[PDB]
Symmetry: D2
Subunit: 334 residues, 4 copies
């Protein structure tokens, strides 16, 4: 397996770690955060959203011990001091949320890693990948700093791919009704985004999203054809994309759902899923797919305007994609 | 002026009562529910959403006393037994949520009332009205069982009117991210709507919105041109409509927002409002308008697809409209 | 082994059903509620608190099919019409919340069952049992309508037993900070308890606890020595008892905790548990014990006043006790 | 009258500012935080808990303008750089949460202020005051760095004073069921307190409190006689103290409530209030008193063990007390 290091052992870092435990291709050997092993161990064992960790965790000296394997714990605020190379770490998952610009993410490379996966939309990255959509575009020689995009983009892109390929998207707009995250605030505090400054668990909070425009990074044909926003709400995990699009081909609900179902069971199995059950957000807590079509919500007007709704566990699905992307990158040679 | 009776002194019944206290053209003289005066008085005084009633409330026998005015309290499950005529009640607000079918609502008329306003989409009603949109259609001789539509329809219809008149709507789809209501469930209990059966405060819950297609009742030109859904979320009040529409005329964001702002300050003042502030749902708690455009959220693609977002206090705005409709009906003669 | 019927397939009914699937001495063969099989199947499959049912569920006609076993579905509002005897049901779990009075619960016996377990404090029941505390008081010949007490009493009685036996309780008072339940209201609606009338997910709500005084039913020596209250809060499951008691013997924190830990590992293992971890309510979601001491919270003043805090999953722990009680009753002969 | 500066314009800082608008003895002339005027103005204008500020707010340069009065906005992380003296600020309310140790709070004095009120329990402070309890212990010459204690201590101390004086407290233990605060975490993140690290809006979270022991600072007679804890829950504001105490004198519920009511209507009017209404936390949102006895919850066992429950708006009541303490200090001479 490829040795992985996780920088920022938080909601995404720990979920990636948990996903990695059940992946034979990658091995997490070290984590970095801003605290001590005791604290990281406690957070890893008991999760308010995902429950008790299905593993034995303990602390040995300054390190974590998980299922008998020692995981080195670092506490370096500056990634340049990480010394990844010294411990054979080849891939670093950059999940602090502070180092989304290449010049920052690349510090892991200076520290000895060979690749960095930024767990968020990035700036100046070598390439942005959405698994199931454009991983074939990854180039092992040219791309060292790779963004895995956002959880919303990972939800929308796979079914946008399907709609576009099968019926052609003329233009479309989305809204994601999205669980709150740690980028928000408990009770009205300063934030660059005056909406995200407001009490997260008390309101429906509109916030801008680059997700629909970011679909263009992975589906160039859709450049300038999409836009949308988010509405953060008082749930702690699980989100849902609501896309309204104008199509080129005339369609029925049955045809749209049938195409989506086909892709889910075929080419996009494990990435896109399809449900005809009348479910609610809690039901998708722990879902590892990127996107699950809520088939009951599909509607069409004039055979040209379609609404497609798709669920995603914003922490889990995206983290499993990070793990898939790391395994994929390792498979192309390091 | 006009004597009003409120059947179902709940979220809408009590909010209507509060709105009526401000209206000199109406007088609420009686309320009916399924409990005693002491309980209704306690509920009216202390509200979890709206705070403490700014008025003196007490109980005298089987009646409420509000600012020295006695309000008769009835506890008749069957509206046939209401004897509204005996106490001079001319207009009954039917807000129990159980009597939206004319067969049931009309019992108030048999019991002596002259008019009934159903506080929800109805079946077999004489007419459905949205203030600011089609009150002109009301006929005092022909219409005695009148629906005030839904809170979502009251939010959407006023700005849909504007968009259609100014640019023409080809087709459009909406989603309302909506606060939970008493039609939902605390913890997974049977419900005819399997989504609404689920714990209200724990999930994002896709479900129905009365606004889907009902806008056509008040804007016939939009028949078959709109559809949509709701997403019930863990907030106790305030909701927001998100409409994505294809327009006939080419527009810019500036033009859409300018038309909306013009209507808000003009023809639709008091019904439609316009905000350029980056607010959140809690900020609209207590808002009496039907619809407030969140101008910052307006977006356009190809000058033809537009997204317009509008806030509404689902309890307050709608209840103030019920009061406006009652005063309007009274003004055309009883 | 023993055929069981569940009357009221709700939070407790379904949780009991899940617990029974693990017990080989029990077989649930029928459930009754107020809806159709399709609805009960959907509720059993997807739970907002406990997640997806770890079993295969389908519907065949008017029945549920769970792991290939058919479970009969009834929809009889009046228990007299249940005909339990016709299907060989020996033990009925009465979990509707409506039939806690013997006059009502006993109808199941008239309908052919041999025993009824009321899932709540009861009136005129033959006996009230708390497993681990007084099951030996059960008499197979004399007792046919049995109450399993409340979830709070099941939490408090086991450790009160320990404290009293080891140090002697002079008097004590409790408060349970308790998750909201279906007996509450979504948004301010009439309730005989004016506090429980108020929006459940919006407030800390003082109210009643069945555990106040009921511990005396199972620990007669404590008659008149305890009292207390509940504080319902905005969490959907998991509660915590906070007991402050004056003891007869002088003690230290260490001694109290040591006795509690001893009982947990000994005589009360599986009923009472002991934790030295700094956990929070979500961590106990799914806990099957009746009571888990939060050892870190133990404190003493003057060697005589002690505070003991204990967690309980109010749905799960209690439901597992209902199953234990059913197996116990069956073991003494039907 | 006295010019005040607020360091840390957050939940307490802004609430203090609002309370000061209603006080003729002090004038807030400057505020310091870590952001720009535009952000502080937006936060002051729209509050998720307390609603819209009923005042005209605007920004002029780097300052706030409230009802035409300019409030200077600073953004100095290090209080040494505050230059309070230059603007005539005599009293600084230290509400950042970072400077509770005298050595840090005293930096405001080095910067030119004459007095500092730390809005929290402090270390090495000159004196700790609870209004209504020991303000007469304040010495204008000797005490420059003063703590206003915690919100919980402000709730408990006033009624503990009454119980002790009237009946004598032998010993007692408290739990405050308390709204979450900004010291907590949105989704499981590192925190020195492993319970406070956990998702604030998802659980009941036990946490240690120095509040009951801190009562001794203001009621020396109660040294070593009290202790207790907190349970943080998913409400955004309002908390409740639950005290269980052994008394010296034999009492009845009636007598305890009568003494509490007497103190509320007499010596402690404005500080301690008394309610016989069955209210819930939301009803106390905006309450300016320090403590409101929930008279219905009072209970006694053996005439010696009493439970007294008291409400408090943890943001508002405490902030009004800060303002009272600032006016009091100004009244003794600066
Ligand atoms: N939460 C989600 O749904 C989600 C989904 C997809 C992607 N993302 C992205 O993933 C990233 C992290 O998100 P999160 O939700 O896990 O955040 P988080 O705040 O929960 O975790 C961040 C972690 O990084 C640590 N940290 C912060 N700065 C550090 C630094 N200088 N060096 C070492 N450790 C540091 C923190 O202590 C914390 O444990 C962000 O870029 C976010 O946009 C989040
Ligand atoms: N809550 C909202 O956002 C909202 C907005 C607009 C319209 N509406 C509609 O208004 C109606 C009332 O909604 P609500 O949210 O106020 O519901 P609610 O449940 O809060 O209140 C209805 C009230 O009617 C009483 N009631 C029930 N059956 C009755 C009967 N047989 N006789 C007399 N009283 C009876 C109840 O005791 C309760 O106080 C529903 O039709 C609803 O769709 C709701
Ligand atoms: N939820 C808890 O924490 C808890 C814990 C211990 C005990 N209890 C007790 O158990 C009982 C059930 O509580 P719950 O929380 O599961 O309630 P619930 O409302 O969730 O479920 C009760 C179920 O009974 C059904 N029902 C109602 N009346 C019926 C009737 N006439 N015939 C057949 N079915 C009927 C409902 O449809 C529902 O499915 C109550 O006595 C409660 O006090 C509750
Ligand atoms: N929230 C409550 O119920 C409550 C009640 C009583 C006392 N307190 C105490 O008051 C204090 C503040 O609590 P809060 O809830 O208002 O906190 P908060 O986090 O909401 O606000 C603190 C404010 O201080 C600012 N700040 C942080 N560091 C600063 C610095 N170095 N210089 C200037 N500004 C800085 C922040 O940006 C924020 O606006 C803490 O000591 C707290 O314990 C809180
Ligand atoms: C997912 O990556 C994150 O939690 C939410 O942000 P979006 O930009 O909506 O994906
Ligand atoms: C408003 O009337 C109700 O709360 C919401 O339902 P819609 O059907 O979305 O109006
Ligand atoms: C448990 O049986 C129920 O949920 C809570 O009520 P208590 O009476 O506090 O047990
Ligand atoms: C009040 O000061 C703060 O919000 C809560 O902490 P306590 O220590 O309970 O006062």
């Amino acid at each position: 397996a490829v040795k992985v290091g996780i920088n920022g052992f938080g909601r995404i870092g720990r979920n990636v770690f948990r996903a990695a435990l059940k992946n034979p291709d990658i091995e997490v050997v070290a984590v970095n955060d801003l605290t001590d092993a005791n604290t990281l161990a406690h957070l890893l064992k008991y999760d308010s959203v995902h429950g008790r960790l299905d593993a034995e965790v303990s602390v040995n000296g300054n390190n974590l011990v998980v299922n008998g394997k020692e995981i080195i714990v670092k506490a370096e605020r500056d990634p340049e001091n990480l010394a990844w190379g010294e411990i054979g770490v080849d891939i670093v998952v950059e999940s602090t949320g502070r180092f989304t610009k290449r010049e920052d993410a690349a510090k892991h490379l200076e520290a000895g890693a060979k690749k960095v996966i930024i767990s968020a939309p990035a700036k100046n990255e070598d390439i942005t990948i959405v698994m199931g959509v454009n991983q074939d575009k990854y180039d092992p020689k040219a791309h060292h700093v790779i963004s895995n995009a956002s959880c919303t983009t990972n939800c929308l892109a796979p079914f946008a791919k399907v709609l576009h390929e099968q019926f052609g998207i003329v233009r479309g707009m989305m809204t994601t009704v999205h669980s709150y995250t740690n980028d928000q605030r408990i009770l009205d505090l300063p934030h660059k985004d005056l909406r995200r400054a407001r009490a997260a668990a008390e309101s429906i909070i509109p916030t801008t999203t680059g997700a629909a425009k970011a679909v263009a990074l992975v589906l160039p044909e859709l450049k300038g054809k999409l836009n949308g926003m988010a509405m953060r709400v008082p749930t702690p995990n699980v989100s849902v994309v609501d896309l309204v699009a104008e199509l080129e081909k005339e369609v029925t609900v049955e045809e749209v759902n049938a195409a989506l179902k086909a892709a889910a069971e075929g080419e996009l199995k494990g990435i896109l899923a399809y449900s005809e059950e009348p479910l609610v957000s809690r039901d998708y807590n722990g879902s590892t797919v990127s996107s699950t079509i809520d088939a009951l919500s599909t509607m069409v007007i004039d055979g040209k305007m379609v609404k497609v709704v798709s669920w995603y566990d914003n922490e889990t699905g995206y983290s499993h994609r990070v793990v898939d992307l790391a395994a994929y990158i390792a498979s192309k040679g390091l």
